[PDB]
Amino acid sequence: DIVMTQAAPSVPVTPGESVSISCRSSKSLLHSNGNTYLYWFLQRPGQSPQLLIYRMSNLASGVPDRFSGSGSGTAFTLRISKVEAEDVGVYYCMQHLEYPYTFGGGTKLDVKRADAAPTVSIFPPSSEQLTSGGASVVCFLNNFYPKDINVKWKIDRQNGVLNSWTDQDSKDSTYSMSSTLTLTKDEYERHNSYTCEATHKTSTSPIVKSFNRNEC
Amino acid sequence: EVQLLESGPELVRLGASVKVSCKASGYSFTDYNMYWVKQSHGKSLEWIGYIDPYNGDASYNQKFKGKATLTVDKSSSTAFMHLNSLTSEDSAVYYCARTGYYYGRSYAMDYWGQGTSVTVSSAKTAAPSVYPLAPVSSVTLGCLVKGYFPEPVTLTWNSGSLSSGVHTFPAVLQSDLYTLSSSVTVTSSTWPSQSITCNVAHPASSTKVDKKIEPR
Numbered sequence: 001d002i003v004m005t006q007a008a009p010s011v012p013v014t015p016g017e018s019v020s021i022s023c024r025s026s027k028s029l030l031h032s033n034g035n036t037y038l039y040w041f042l043q044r045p046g047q048s049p050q051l052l053i054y055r056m057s058n059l060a061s062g063v064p065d066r067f068s069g070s071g072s073g074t075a076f077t078l079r080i081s082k083v084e085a086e087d088v089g090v091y092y093c094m095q096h097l098e099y100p101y102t103f104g105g106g107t108k109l110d111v112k113r114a115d116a117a118p119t120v121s122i123f124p125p126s127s128e129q130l131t132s133g134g135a136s137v138v139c140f141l142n143n144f145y146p147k148d149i150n151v152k153w154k155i156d157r158q159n160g161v162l163n164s165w166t167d168q169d170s171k172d173s174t175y176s177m178s179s180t181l182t183l184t185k186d187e188y189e190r191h192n193s194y195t196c197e198a199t200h201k202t203s204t205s206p207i208v209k210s211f212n213r214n215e216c
Numbered sequence: 217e218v219q220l221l222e223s224g225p226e227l228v229r230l231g232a233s234v235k236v237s238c239k240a241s242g243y244s245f246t247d248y249n250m251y252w253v254k255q256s257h258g259k260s261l262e263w264i265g266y267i268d269p270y271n272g273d274a275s276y277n278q279k280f281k282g283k284a285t286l287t288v289d290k291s292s293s294t295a296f297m298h299l300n301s302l303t304s305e306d307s308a309v310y311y312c313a314r315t316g317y318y319y320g321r322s323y324a325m326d327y328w329g330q331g332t333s334v335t336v337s338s339a340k341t342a343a344p345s346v347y348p349l350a351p352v353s354s355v356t357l358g359c360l361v362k363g364y365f366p367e368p369v370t371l372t373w374n375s376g377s378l379s380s381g382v383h384t385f386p387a388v389l390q391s392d393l394y395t396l397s398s399s400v401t402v403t404s405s406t407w408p409s410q411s412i413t414c415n416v417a418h419p420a421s422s423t424k425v426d427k428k429i430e431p432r
């Protein structure tokens with residue numbers, strides 16, 4: 001089998017500048033007919049993969065002029081000049097020369113926008129949920145950058161936390177995380193305060209959003 | 217515009233089999249080979265095989281030999297993928313994709329279907345319980361879809377009308393059950409002066425419910 005290798009798992013890039021995604025193959029992809037059977041695909045967040053470049057250097061329909069493909073026999077490069085916010089996603093290489101066809105690991109493209117602080121909102125468990133037992137404390141952290149951020153849960157620091165991240169937004173290049181402290185009705189109603197501490201690069205002290213069980 | 221429409225999500229018991237379909241339109245179906253690709257939860261891509269809808273001969277990847285079977289229906293312009301004796305490792309998203317051919321040259325996987333998520337589990341379908349997430353310049357509201365199985369679930373707020381300022385987070389497992397979360401941000405003058413609910417639909421359990429965000 002031909003093994004396709006993309007060394008870089010992610011490349012941080014500020015909008016307007018150029019990027020190069022690398023791909024190496026375990027064997028030459030040069031065919032006797034002159035063509036080179038290397039393929040670039042793009043997968044946008046929440047989308048299906050789309051053909052970007054076919055046979056090393058040919059752009060598929062509608063593919064922006066900003067993209068180009070080159071390479072020798074082993075090393076290949078996807079140059080994305082002047083990156084836009086909608087270029088976010090994972091770029092895969094693929095060989096079409098021999099059976100079976102194989103794909104690279106993929107390189108995630110992340111757009112380096114201006115650092116944005118997280119907007120934090122904490123939410124006590126609903127009345128409908130307490131009626132049927134169990135209490136989920138939901139904490140949203142929306143529109144922030146970079147992606148690196150630590151979320152801490154102080155009650156009176158515990159576990160049972162369920163975290164979820166969105167992909168980088170196509171428009172504003174930001175991230176959003178939803179942290180949920182899943183507890184039982186007996187454990188929830190036993191303690192009082194519940195805080196949502198968030199530590200980010202854009203922060204003096206961490207951002208804190210809290211409430212107490214019997215205040216409102 | 218070339219359209220590939222795939223079968224909906226499927227929940228399959230261990231050892232059982234599934235048959236996913238890919239209906240083509242916008243071109244002559246029998247003119248081009250239909251490729252099939254497996255994408256795992258780690259978003260890695262593998263080529264499964266392809267089928268020539270005309271003569272019906274199909275080449276397969278060695279790894280998927282004996283597990284995948286490709287067929288075609290010319291009367292409904294549809295390609296099919298059968299997967300037998302399913303295990304947990306078969307739980308993934310499966311794509312079909314056309315491969316162009318013009319004047320002696322090929323265009324591999326130039327257009328892809330939306331994909332078909334397959335879940336292999338002994339668990340039974342559990343209906344979600346939705347809970348309005350009311351708060352304790354701009355106010356954020358929330359909607360918690362907890363304890364459903366399997367994927368997926370659709371979520372809108374004002375029957376799809378309120379789309380901007382919405383962050384619907386990817387589902388995450390917790391003891392073999394999915395939890396979904398979404399947050400909407402609007403100006404403080406809009407809520408609670410204007411009503412806003414949460415439309416959640418879980419087709420596998422045939423459950424569609426609405427929960428108006430009520431002040432505490």
